[PDB]
Amino acid sequence: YTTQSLASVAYLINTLANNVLQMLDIQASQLRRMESSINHISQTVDIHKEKVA
Amino acid sequence: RFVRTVLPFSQEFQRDKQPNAQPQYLHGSKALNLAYSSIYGSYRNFVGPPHFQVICRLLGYQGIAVVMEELLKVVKSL
């Protein structure tokens, strides 16, 4: 029961950790794409304000 | 260069002199504040190319346009 318990705990932790890392990796790349998208909007607003000027 | 007129034609108006904040919110220290205010002391006695250069940057095309348009209105009024 000891061996079985050690193996089980290690497994469930390994699985949940891997999932958490995957979640953080996805959220990072989300912000990376969003910054790129915000930057292009900002450039577009800059261009527009200059045209009015 | 432009310079100030003679005393009897000098149209004075009261200015609300700002309360002094801490040096960190200006040039950084008392020594630096004093150093820089001396540096820019030279520029207070006339208006010329350096002032016009600064005005140009800070106003941009839109600021210049509105100032020109408004100067025209002052002239039209006078």
Partner: protein, 78 residues
């Protein structure tokens, strides 16, 4: 001054010295090759996204088209 700093990214090159046995057109094309990696709009048109390309094209038009290029104001004022 803005336009002078824009020049290298806008393909604009100054006249080069021609030694005997060389042509003005021969070296100007050869110098254009050297600074081709700095030509902004073509590089983005090559490697950038439709969004990047459109922003750069708009940006380029704003950078090259200044008042000093062929326009004046004082006449209109008067």
């Amino acid at each position: 001054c803005d336009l002078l700093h824009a020049a290298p990214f806008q393909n604009i090159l100054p006249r080069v010295h021609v030694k005997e046995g060389e042509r003005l057109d021969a070296k100007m094309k050869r110098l254009e090759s050297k600074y081709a990696p700095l030509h902004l709009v073509p590089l983005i048109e090559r490697l950038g996204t439709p969004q990047q390309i459109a922003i750069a094209r708009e940006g380029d038009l704003l950078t090259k088209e200044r008042l000093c290029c062929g326009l004046s104001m004082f006449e209109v004022i008067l």
